[model samples]
Target: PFTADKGKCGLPEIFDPPEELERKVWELARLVWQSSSVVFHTGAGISTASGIPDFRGPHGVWTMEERGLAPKFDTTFESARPTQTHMALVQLERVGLLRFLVSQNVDGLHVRSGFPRDKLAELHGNMFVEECAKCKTQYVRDTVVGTMGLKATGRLCTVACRGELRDTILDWEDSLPDRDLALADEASRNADLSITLGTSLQIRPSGNLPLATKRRGGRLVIVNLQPTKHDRHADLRIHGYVDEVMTRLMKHLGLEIPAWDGPRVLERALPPLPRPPTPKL
Candidate 1:
């Protein structure tokens, strides 16, 4: 009876006590240390700390719609800053602990976190990113593109082709980008440990890539407050906030999570990252 209440979206909300959670986090850190390559799956849950609303959480937009109430939200993709969990992942990637980062989110925080564009795959596309239809170039805008569904954003590429720029955000039932999906699949299969943060593993085939790791005799670990679709399949399951879990995990690994500065455009195609403006009183 108690088991049924904690799994598969049956529970509204749940979190493990700190002591037991710390023990589990230490275990996760050990896995992180022992693993050769790691892939992290990001969901809307991780961005909630930045004031962004999720789609399937207990009080998510769609969940609230089912109950006949509008969900309130304050952060826009441009206005929101990356959370601590995002920074922790960045540090992990920098030290060679995390090889690939995969996200089902379109909010663009992971990219804004300054994580490498080469290793990160945004499966759902990004709100602040635009792509050239002719040249296939991805441009990271400092502001939101204010569009969706691969439609043209009224801007043309500055390159020789001078093609139209389209929004990168994927809508319902749309096929995922081939390059991004292929990369995620490759990383997922190659990983020794697949750790998902804040996602419920509901959407696919993005949600199912973590299974690629486990099927190859690798480990699967999930850190989420609510039971996910793949809960029973995980090697270790912990109910906790992604930020707290990552913070403790970073500490156990003897690392520090860097603070977020002002936002900027980042992509592998870009030549250089400009320095942020100096502060003034």
Candidate 2:
């Protein structure tokens, strides 16, 4: 539910659910149900529902700037992962409406939520995995943990090859991964419908998915708590607390999601990779 009055607990204030927004949400869910393939794009808002701190909100990293604790970059691979909102997308994928999830969020929640590997596209690289700087071979962090012992112990990669274990995540100046960008472009371009959830279509490349679909004559569904630049373009716009909203969606769709006691808040955070010891910097 939305806060009729502008008030929030974690980041942005509580989102008071309204009649018009409810109607739009039902319509959007129905559209998702009917579509053969749909794409879900996300941002920091998706994680706030789970008591996870967001990096760029009014209370986010920038808020620490005056205290000299603000990060050089707003968010990084280690700090971001899918929150409960992302898990909802995973549930939607489980129901078969979701074809591809192209997220600007590099948080590893999509994978954690059990989204099908082949079907999921990480538009941003996942932190738990390792990618070769030169040859581009992706491996689980644990696979190389033994070799990097005592170097940057517990740091995530191998020193076996000259190629670095690059975090696939996009830094402020890093170029987007060609394959990921291509796949996201293709998915959005050909999607029967595009569902923008928990994300503001403000940033580039990622924000382009819905536009790509719109150019191809697909419907756009934007679900977020805040006003975004792409609101006018959405065929359906839903503003509400995503967790409560998804619970209603499941009920309306006649599906029973088990008790909310599924996963605890902390386990949902990025699991630390096992590593060796390192000398103090």
Candidate 3:
């Protein structure tokens, strides 16, 4: 079985065939400059360097589960800091280098990174967020909501429009949220290029989104350490640390990675869209 401590290895170094890989990264940077629309799709792997455990990796939760051992966590969802990659993405978005982002991660790191909320679609939902089931008002909190699969978190929306607040995390068999999926889908189909980071691309729907870009003749790039489900379809596959890749890429793009000045609420990042009614079961 695939078993090695990804934590001990930390993140991998740059991809093999160093010169060619470096050139490819530069090419990607040029693509970013040339493309009119760009999108990012992120998964659990991106958060591993921030002390979060991912599935499928040697030391991930699923691997531990298969071994009948408890998985390890460096910090609670609330305590973990956003990684260099997350902050880099924020900078890219700030400079309009990135048009949209879609994440399957539930850690809420992206939210905490202060990226504009309207530019991101968290398909699996966020641990720090609770939504009103009736009015769909979102409450981004300082603490984890302490439940999953869209369950009630024993809180109510305090907005002028009232409703019970529920945790937004999705459990197995839960259909993806409609609005987030729609936004992500639209972005992917319209993007001139799609970049996927730290995902094996095994999950359905979420994994399938980058193909929307490819289907429309847009370029697809996959950056992951392990083989992904869609590796053969990618225009470029870079096996390396996400942080290192982003570091080089930023330099090539002539951008500075922004510093994180501790946690701050992103309530003003964008005006909240009028909430559609909660879907009927």
Candidate 4:
């Protein structure tokens, strides 16, 4: 949870016995997969291993700023690779175990991971996509938009309608996109299980959407090294690195975490490349 200072949040000083935690997470993962209506909510914490910066961790960008320090970035958003957790999610989705995904990250790794856009809702925005202001056609680029806050990118729409194009990134005052919010809301409300990864659950609207499952009498699980604002509401909280937890959970489910082949964006909701086969146990 965030402290009185606002920018800072309390992190878990210790976690449960590693084996015990893994066992509990494995049980929950099995149950959730059996239900097959799992909705995922992701935060910046999930992407830290990929070299993008987070906001409230000990070394996160916001936490560093709160300490009067600047956070260092060795990799740009365009250069970051999808972590094990990212690829695990892709596998889960491909196997029909994941019903939907909601992300508060603007780093663009979710799209770059080749997750299906129709099954994903990018609540915060994606740095690699630009939208047409008039026709609402979106273009997912191999490069960053070079600007944020819905500004023109010095480019126009190439569609037959020919509208002006703007960056999809949102400013602090900007409202969340209507389509993304609606899809996330629907998914959460209908999900039998909601799993949160690497997020502190501090932001409103996006962070609050996961609670829709609990409010509807479904299970809520949180996986993060840091204590989250919604810990009190979580049915199960796994305190560990998200990647480690996901890797263990995948093994328990007898699924293989596919390696990211390369950068891709699903502009037309097309089927992804054939998934790698899960090995026989």
Relative to the true structure, how large is the alpha-carbon lDDT of every model?
Answer: 0.83, 0.60, 0.84, 0.84
**What digit string (tens of lDDT, one per residue) describes model 4 on residues 143-230?**
9998899999988889857788899888877899999999999999999899999889988888899899987588899888788888
Model 3: how far residue 62 lies from native, Å: 0.6
The better-scoring model by lDDT among 2 and 3 is 3
Report the lDDT tens digits of candidate 3 across residue range 1-281.
Answer: 24432222222334557787698788778777768899999999899998899887777787677778877999888789999899999888776678899999999999889988888899999998999999888988989988988988998778755687899898777899999999999999999999999988878899999999998589999998877889899998888889989999988777778889777666434433232222222
Indicate the residue-level lDDT of 49 in model 2: 56
Instruction: Order the candidates by lDDT, highest first.
Output: 4, 3, 1, 2
TM-score of each: 0.90, 0.72, 0.89, 0.91
Comparing candidate 2 with candidate 4, which one achieves the higher TM-score?
Answer: 4
Task: Supply the TM-score for candidate 3.
Answer: 0.89
For every candidate in turn, the CA RMSD to the true structure comes to 7.6, 12.3, 8.4, 3.6
**Clash pairs of candidate 4?**
none
Quantify how close model 4 is to the true structure by its C-alpha RMSD in Å.
3.6
Over the full model, what C-alpha lDDT does candidate 1 score relative to the true structure?
A: 0.83
Residue-wise C-alpha lDDT for candidate 1, range 199-247, written one tens digit per residue: 8888878889999998769999998888888988898998988888888
Residue-pair clash count for candidate 2: 14
lDDT of 3 at 29: 81
Worst 10 residues of 3 by lDDT: 272-281
